Swiss-Prot record:
The gene is Plcd1. Ca(2+) 5 binds at D455, Y456, D457. GO terms for molecular function: calcium ion binding; calcium-dependent phospholipid binding; enzyme binding; GTPase activating protein binding; inositol 1,4,5 trisphosphate binding; phosphatidylinositol-4,5-bisphosphate 5-phosphatase activity; phosphatidylinositol-4,5-bisphosphate binding; phosphatidylinositol-4,5-bisphosphate phospholipase C activity. Transmembrane segments: none annotated. Keywords: Calcium, Glycoprotein, Hydrolase, Lipid degradation, Lipid metabolism, Metal-binding, Phosphoprotein, Repeat, Transducer. The chain holds residues 205 to 756 of 756 of the full protein. Binds 5 Ca(2+) ions per subunit. Two of the Ca(2+) ions are bound to the C2 domain. This is 1-phosphatidylinositol 4,5-bisphosphate phosphodiesterase delta-1. Residues 363-486 form the C2 domain. It comes from Rattus norvegicus. It is an enzyme of class 3 (hydrolase).
Length: 505
């Protein structure tokens, strides 16, 4: 460990806490936990649980003390994670209408690559669901021998069977979360093949499928808690081209065209009705209607999808959409990128269940909040965040060297900013920057802090090494280790960044 561990900075901070002593007394640890780690629970109980839980040495663990070993073990642990461990469990109110949550949503889920000539696969649904995705898309078309198929219409994208896709979805639907999955159907099938679709839905999904409405739910969308272990369908509903068999299965997500906003001035889109917006239109409506849109999204679910020109399956930033209350922001889950990074980073919250409760100011029908034209309100609560990028350890390296860490704030217009550190030459094992940044965040509830590590290269553009995105209210203070994720969003086994975080009011 004289090479492995033996981190100068880990010693500097341990002594800062131990003093002259070579161990941490429950009394010296509790002080560290409250003063440094800014723990709200800092007391003897917390410190004793951390010693029992992370102290390797049994003697010190017996004499209620903490060595440099247990100090580092705790700092690399789930407890020392810059991402609130309390938040890795479902801890939010799950009894509010579906429209009060941001839902993990997939665009043209069937695709594994591009939008024109690429492959379609059940694997695409599996991967998406395993990543907590709750809203899946199925483009249904007529297939050979009365069997409906799924593929992107009028393109060379590979085709797969509707029934296969349903078996895959049935199997992985609740693997990563018990909360409801919505299947958005874009039907192009004939009346005969729609009946086939309906029969497969009922035969393959069985009881998982929400075939009937919930008693009592009549004025608003039911809650995620109420639809647990259930799958609901989104699509056109009979206004009268569509068979009763299918139409009768659309209960809370009746697909409708957007007929303008209106607010609670009695006249408009029902809670069981859902509209879709292109990324471009959504942005226009946000710039034009502002809080009208936000208010609209308190009672109705709104879907956003990539602009048509994005045939490369590229992604757009989900944040500006979320700031507007939009809950079903569909992104191409097959495409790695800061968009998906910030996307899964938001959905790492609330136990990764795919439903994240929007800030109360976004769950108020009369709210006057507007992300594009900020005023004073409970949303405006500026903090000063200081992040010290101390060291990095065992940086993943598969084409590797010269690191630099970019720290960015993703939130409302004002708060969107970024800072970066100097490049450390040829050192991924133990790079040390000891550099502090400082961001002013006016609307912390809509912000996310992203740590990004690149491989500097003057003539070839920097190579992505790893990243991690943490929602503001899940960002822990004091000394913490940021555990890096790869491009597929899979956590590198030992890649981390030792940092110190400070939020001041």
């Amino acid at each position: 460990y004289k090479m492995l561990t033996q981190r100068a900075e880990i010693d500097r901070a341990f002594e800062e806490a131990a003093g002259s002593a070579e161990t941490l007394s429950v009394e010296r640890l509790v002080t560290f936990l409250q003063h440094q780690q800014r723990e709200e629970e800092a007391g003897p109980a917390l410190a004793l649980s951390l010693i029992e839980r992370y102290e390797p040495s049994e003697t010190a663990k017996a004499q209620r003390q903490m060595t440099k070993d247990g100090f580092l073990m705790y700092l690399l642990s789930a407890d020392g994670n810059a991402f609130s461990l309390a938040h890795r469990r479902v801890y939010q109110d799950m009894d509010q209408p579906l429209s009060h949550y941001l839902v993990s949503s997939s665009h043209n889920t069937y695709l594994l690559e591009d939008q024109l000539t690429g492959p379609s696969s059940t694997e695409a649904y599996i991967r998406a669901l395993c990543k907590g995705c709750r809203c899946l898309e199925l483009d249904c078309w007529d297939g050979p021998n009365q069997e409906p198929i799924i593929y992107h219409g009028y393109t060379f994208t590979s085709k797969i069977l509707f029934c296969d896709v349903l078996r895959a979805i049935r199997d992985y639907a609740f693997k990563a979360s018990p909360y409801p999955v919505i299947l958005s159907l874009e039907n192009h099938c004939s009346l005969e093949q729609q009946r086939v679709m309906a029969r497969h839905l009922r035969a393959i999904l069985g009881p998982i499928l929400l075939d009937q409405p919930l008693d009592g739910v009549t004025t608003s969308l039911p809650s995620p808690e109420q639809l647990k272990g259930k799958i609901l369908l989104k699509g056109k509903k009979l206004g009268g081209k569509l068979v009763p068999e299918l139409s009768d299965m659309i209960i809370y997500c009746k697909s409708v065209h957007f007929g303008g906003f209106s607010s609670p001035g009695t006249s408009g889109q029902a809670f069981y009705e859902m509209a879709s917006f292109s990324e471009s239109r959504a942005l226009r409506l946000l710039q034009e209607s502002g809080n009208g849109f936000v208010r609209h999204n308190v009672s109705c679910l709104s879907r956003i999808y990539p602009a048509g020109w994005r045939t490369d399956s590229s992604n757009y930033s989900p944040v500006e959409m979320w700031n507007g209350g939009c809950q079903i922001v569909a992104l191409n889950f097959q495409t790695p990128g800061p968009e998906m990074d910030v996307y899964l980073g938001c959905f790492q919250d609330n136990g990764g269940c795919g439903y994240v409760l929007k800030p109360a100011f976004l769950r108020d029908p009369n709210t006057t909040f507007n992300s594009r034209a900020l005023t004073q309100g409970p949303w405006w609560r500026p903090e000063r965040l200081r992040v010290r990028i101390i060291s990095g350890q065992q940086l993943p390296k598969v084409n590797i060297v010269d690191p630099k860490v970019i720290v960015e704030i993703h939130g409302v217009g004002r708060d969107t900013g970024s800072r970066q550190t100097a490049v450390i030459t040829n050192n991924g094992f133990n790079p040390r920057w000891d550099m502090e940044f400082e961001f002013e965040v006016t609307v912390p509830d809509l912000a996310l802090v992203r740590f990004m590590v690149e491989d500097y290269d003057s003539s070839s553009k920097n190579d992505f090494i790893g990243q991690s995105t943490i929602p503001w209210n899940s960002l822990k203070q004091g000394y913490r280790h940021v555990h890096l994720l790869s491009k597929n969003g899979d956590q590198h086994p030992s890649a981390t960044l030792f940092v110190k975080i400070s939020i001041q009011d």
